[PDB]
Symmetry: C3
Subunit: 275 residues, 3 copies
Amino acid sequence: AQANEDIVVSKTSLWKEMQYNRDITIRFKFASSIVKSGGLGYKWSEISFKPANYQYTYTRDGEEVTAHTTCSVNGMNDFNFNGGSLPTDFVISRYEVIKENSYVYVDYWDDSQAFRNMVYVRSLAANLNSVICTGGDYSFALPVGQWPVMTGGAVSLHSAGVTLSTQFTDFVSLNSLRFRFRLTVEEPSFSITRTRVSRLYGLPAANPNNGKEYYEVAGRFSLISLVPSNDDYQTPITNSVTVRQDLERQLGELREEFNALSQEIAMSQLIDLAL
Amino acid sequence: AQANEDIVVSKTSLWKEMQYNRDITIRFKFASSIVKSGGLGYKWSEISFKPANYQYTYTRDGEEVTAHTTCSVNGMNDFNFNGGSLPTDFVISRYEVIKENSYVYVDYWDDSQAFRNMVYVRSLAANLNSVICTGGDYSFALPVGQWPVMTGGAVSLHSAGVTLSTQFTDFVSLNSLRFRFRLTVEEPSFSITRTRVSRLYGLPAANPNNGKEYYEVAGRFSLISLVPSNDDYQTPITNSVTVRQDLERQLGELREEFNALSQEIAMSQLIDLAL
Amino acid sequence: AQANEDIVVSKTSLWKEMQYNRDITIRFKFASSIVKSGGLGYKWSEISFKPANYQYTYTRDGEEVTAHTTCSVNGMNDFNFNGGSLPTDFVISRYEVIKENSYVYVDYWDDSQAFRNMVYVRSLAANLNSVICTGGDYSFALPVGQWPVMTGGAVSLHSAGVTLSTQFTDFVSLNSLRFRFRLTVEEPSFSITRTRVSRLYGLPAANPNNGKEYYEVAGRFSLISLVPSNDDYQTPITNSVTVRQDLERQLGELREEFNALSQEIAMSQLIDLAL
């Protein structure tokens, strides 16, 4: 056997079952959507996770292989902290934190032959070593006074069942292997500095990557794919996405309204400033 | 014969033709998009239909089926109502109403064997009884004065042709059966109370669901699908979607601009409280 | 041998390899998103290319072909101009221009037999003639003063390698042929009136279409597709889409914030105007 076997478990005139075994380096990354409310600047609408893409390249055994991994979270816990009700009080309406009840979906795709025409897969199995994602420090740009910082928060990712997924980005639609990761809250806890909250275990979305370029997991997978026998057929990969046109229309109308209102406000201020 | 047979009509080494005949309980739902124009709040930008997902789980004959149904509207008619150009008058720039000339699409997918690898389908036929969708009572909120409530509106969906489609959500991409419904307006008439619009037939987008958790229609479908012979292959079902990155960037840009403007307004209002 | 043959290069019980040769009329267009900042109204946030859909019908030999095209731009240079930092000074933060270093993608799909089950394709080749795309006139509608107009800009799209891709919209998902075009700058040059910028080549995103219905290019392609033997088999074409729910929720929250702020501003003007 070998670390990157390529076995033919069946063949036919037009189709063939190919067994692919591979050792892969899954480098995944977190993306945080931070929405801040309007007013003085002491209110934050939300700090949540969103799916994050990451395309990279690494050296296999004598080969330069280009991979694309997208990370996402499920079963997140929404926490809320209030400094009061006045406009000056620091308050976050909600923010997502990862706990033992959550899952992390890291779907990995590669340019190897194991993914070229992956439309049907059976006997899918994998091995994955656990890792630790430690929470970094994220500071809040308050208009006045001290700056709170959300520091800490570690979760150990442990391997779970692997399945089949699809990465839908604006450029490429890829048929990927979704590795599911369970989480265990670890000793490094997260606390909001200068706030009445601390020593609570999890990994908030404020700064999951903690300044790290990525989180790397060395995995292995073995699958059987039903692909055309001729190794020339190529499934469409590159994409032209024009989804959610109604959302674009709403964004345009909202921007038009905001532009008109801001134009009126700016004129009403400049007339006074022109004394 | 059976209500839920799994017949074989052809088989080869790697592929086969499965004739699936199944009874289904299509539970669908409407989604209303409401955009309210800025200002005193006496006008609404748009009241439109939008695609609506609904994932449920119902008991078939001895088994539990997890179903995912997505509803959409086509050919919607654009009505409008304005009392004048005065800011303090009721104005709906454009709202969507469903009439006979329009159609209702319902994509339906199940975790049963009939949808495991549905990529190719032929001889797709179905039977599907009609349903009645009545209109709810949606109230319009104003700073002061009366509250015109849009009430009434009923339309009967009658079964029409059936095709194949794809349900694209934020979590799952599903090859599904698209049931098409023609429309016949029923006796109830939608009208805005305390307003000069009444005796109008159709189904508006204000509150299509009428407070119902779902609209349920019983269906049956028979189809022949070209599926891999081994009942262990799996087409990707879940998804990791990061499309419309430019739209996210524009949303962030406008959020930043609005935050700046709101902070400016807050500073201006706070300066007026010094003495 | 005729221009629109569909030859059988292989056939089996359930699958076959078909050689489709077709002469097509690709009609495409450029879509541009123009984002305008707030303030007095002398700052455009950006003028950027975005994917552009266009569905049409053209007469083949004795039959009408319904085609769907999607244009996109890759590797577009970003040019910025800032005459002065003052609010009243004209500014365009960044606009996209396509040069030799840029590429134009055009995804093309038809209701013909060549695209009906296009999931696996080999031996793909094409013959496409070049087309000249010239930018039109776009006027910057400033609040008060002169309106600069950006006029000119001409490039030649020369046929490049052809591959597979997929067009995703709010209505259809189409496995399609991706024609790539390289760019060669032409004699006409884009310039902005009443500005110290001119004699620089490219195709600015302000008005690539030159106020024209479409850019038409006659092409031909030959491909070998692995499709089900029975032609009654159909893959999904239409889709129901609910992608980017987080985006819609954030847009709704932003709309609520804007409505609250605008109502507050309008009430402030009303009370300030009440003597």
